[PDB]
Amino acid sequence: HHHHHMVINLAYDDNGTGDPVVFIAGRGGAGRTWHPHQVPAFLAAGYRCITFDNRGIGATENAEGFTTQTMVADTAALIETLDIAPARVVGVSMGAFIAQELMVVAPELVSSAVLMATRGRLDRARQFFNKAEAELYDSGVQLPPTYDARARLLENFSRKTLNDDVAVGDWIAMFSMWPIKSTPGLRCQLDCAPQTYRLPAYRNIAAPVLVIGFADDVVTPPYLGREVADALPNGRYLQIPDAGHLGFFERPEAVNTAMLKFFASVKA
Amino acid sequence: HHHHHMVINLAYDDNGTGDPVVFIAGRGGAGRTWHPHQVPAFLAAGYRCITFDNRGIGATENAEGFTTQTMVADTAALIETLDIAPARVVGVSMGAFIAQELMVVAPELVSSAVLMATRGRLDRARQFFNKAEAELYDSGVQLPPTYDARARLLENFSRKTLNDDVAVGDWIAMFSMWPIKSTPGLRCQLDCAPQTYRLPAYRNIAAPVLVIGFADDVVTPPYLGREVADALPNGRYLQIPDAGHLGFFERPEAVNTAMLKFFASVKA
Ligand code: NA
Ligand code: NA
């Protein structure tokens, strides 16, 4: 348990009534990124949905010097403040890493979890990708807007989507509804990632977990998600075809139905 | 046939004896990019190999204001100067587009061709990618080196390669042997691409053609290569699994054996 933490106010929304589900967004994602595709489906299934702005987002976008354990403690504090322990947790990418590490140190707060687009370590390519992203920020160079959108398309969507002229046009426009500003908080979130080999620690997590991998994901490749599921004694792996790193936007029905079926299967 | 062309000296190498094969590199590639993996195999099969520096490369790296038809005429002039008509042609990406357009206007110069990683048009994503690349150059922004290498890795290699820690390390190092300097010639080569729907024109090409698509290619996706093969009355499509846009470096044995078997099958 943390002993060097200071609670800060994080924006959050608390919607619906019933069993609580805490959503943890990935790097650069605000709480509202769960609202186009996930929260309506979960509300329709009868869940209460908690979404929030991670440290480094929005009102804390200039925060720096925080670590994964800071964000774990932030999430734990939100669960305790809302008096929703134990909660279901849905995390994606950085948010799934936070969820994993939360379950290691405070398992009593999490009844079950979905971990989307996750890993328990970085391989050579993904370590290099992170070094390159940090180098881009630290150089002060700003990518021109269309080139930034091109990188976002390549890095987040399936080949099937890129080959779909209408879908591609739509996602280019979606980028205006979900800008990712280069902030100090975004740069610090880049380091809130597996710096070490965390799979052995996850063998201690006894709670039921669904790990979802996205077949075309190049940011968190599916084989690294399968490693997490294999470490988890009560974790199962599911792969979504024709889905990139943003698979929960790209194939929302497929992802939601898998998550809702899992959460129903572990009902108390 | 061209009527507004001026021949310029292009660097070239002419290796081996026997049936001639003219290699046409893609955007940013010098003639020597065919030497690590293709020319030795073709020499061992008994072919004479012509490799050259496209307009916009090397000694003409500051050239601008040229078009696809300029490069078609450059290639035709090289074939005629060396007195190797009709020649086999191997082109990749921009080089395959040049080869396609050469066969439309001067089919007598080409006995058969391999077209790797090609297309006869741009779809919505690939048009946007090109607009983004032009925007990056025209903005004067220079990508920091590690970020530039990250983009090159993501855009050119298969998921299988990216997941291979040793191979990834090797390709990062290969980038020091094959730098792609941002030059006026490189920017102009960006426009030497299908601006229009060229598939109907290719229905006129009677020569035998092998079109090779790379399964993981996101720069020239395989379905666009299959469109070219389908237009060509004597064109066949072959797909290489686990290969990105640089598939002829990544899977050299698979690509070379397919090309050599094809060229043997059409021997006079
Ligand atoms: Na498991
Ligand atoms: Na055909």
Sequential DSSP letters for A100-145: HHHHHH-GGGEEEEEEES--SS--HHHHHHHHHHHHHHHTT----H
DSSP letter assigned to residue B179: -
**Ligand 2 centre and the CA of B226: distance in Å?**
9
Question: B90: Cβ–Cβ under 8 A, 6 or more apart, which residues?
Answer: B21, B22, B23, B24, B34, B38, B99, B113, B114, B116, B259
Contact A146 B124 (CB under 8 A): no
Task: Write down the catalytic residue from A93, A111, A112, A158.
Answer: A93
Q: How far is B63 from chain A (nearest CA, A)?
A: 24
Q: What tokens appear for B5 in the block? A: 């062309």
Return the SS3 of A154: helix
DSSP letter assigned to residue A234: T
Binding residues of B: 27, 93-94, 126, 245
Experimental method: X-ray
Breaks (C-N over 2.5 A) in chain A follow: none
Cα B189 to chain centroid distance, Å, stands at 12
Helix B68-81 crosses helix B94-105 at what angle (to 10 degrees)?
Answer: 70
Question: Residue B114 sits in which domain range?
Answer: 1-268
Contact B147 A135 (CB under 8 A): yes
Q: Parallel, antiparallel, or unpaired for β A209-214 and B110-116?
A: unpaired
Pick left, alpha or beta for residue A117 (phi over 0 → left; psi -120 to 50 → alpha; otherwise beta).
left
Q: What tokens appear for A191 in the block? A: 């380091």
Chain A CB contacts of B139 under 8 Å are 144
Alpha-carbon gap, residue A222 to A116, rounded angstroms? 10
Torsion of CA B107, B112, B116, B122, to 10 degrees: 30
Residue A122, φ and ψ in degrees, nearest 5:
-110, 135
Q: What tokens appear for A137 in the block? A: 């920020």
Chain B CB contacts of A216 under 8 Å are 159
Task: Tell me the C-alpha to C-alpha distance, in Å, between residue B5 and each of B25, B109, B188.
Answer: 21, 18, 17
Residue B195, φ and ψ in degrees, nearest 5:
-90, -10
> Would you call A245 a catalytic residue per the annotation?
yes
Q: Three-state SS string across B96-111, please?
A: HHHHHHHHHHCHHHEE
Alpha-carbon gap, residue A248 to A101, rounded angstroms? 22
Task: Please tell me what resolution, in angstroms, this structure has.
Answer: 1.5
Q: Is A83 exposed, middle or buried (CB count within 10 Å of its CB: 0-12, 13-18, 19+)?
A: exposed
**Residue B212 and residue B116 in contact, taking contact as beta carbons nearer than 8 Å:** yes
Q: What tokens appear for B48 in the block? A: 């004479």
**Ligand 2 centre and the CA of B268: distance in Å?**
21
**Residue B104 and residue B204 in contact, taking contact as beta carbons nearer than 8 Å:** yes
Residue type, A186: L
Contact B128 A142 (CB under 8 A): no
Number of domains present in the structure of chain A: 1
Cα B196 to chain centroid distance, Å, stands at 19
B188-217 b/e (C-beta count within 10 Å ≥ 16 → b): bbbebbbeeebbebbeebebbbbbbbbbbb
Q: Tell whether omega for the bond before B184 is within 30 degrees of 0, i.e. cis.
A: no
DSSP letter assigned to residue A11: -
Nearest-Å Rg of the Cα atoms of chain B is 17
Task: Tell me the C-alpha to C-alpha distance, in Å, between residue B111 and each of A191, B90, B114, B267.
Answer: 56, 11, 11, 9
Question: A161: Cβ–Cβ under 8 A, 6 or more apart, which residues?
Answer: A167, A168, A171, A242, A244, A250
**Which of B133, B144, B168 is closest, CB to CB, to A139?**
B144
**Residue B22 and residue B87 in contact, taking contact as beta carbons nearer than 8 Å:** yes
Question: A164: Cβ–Cβ under 8 A, 6 or more apart, which residues?
Answer: none
Other residues' Cβ atoms within 10 Å of the Cβ of residue B83? 7
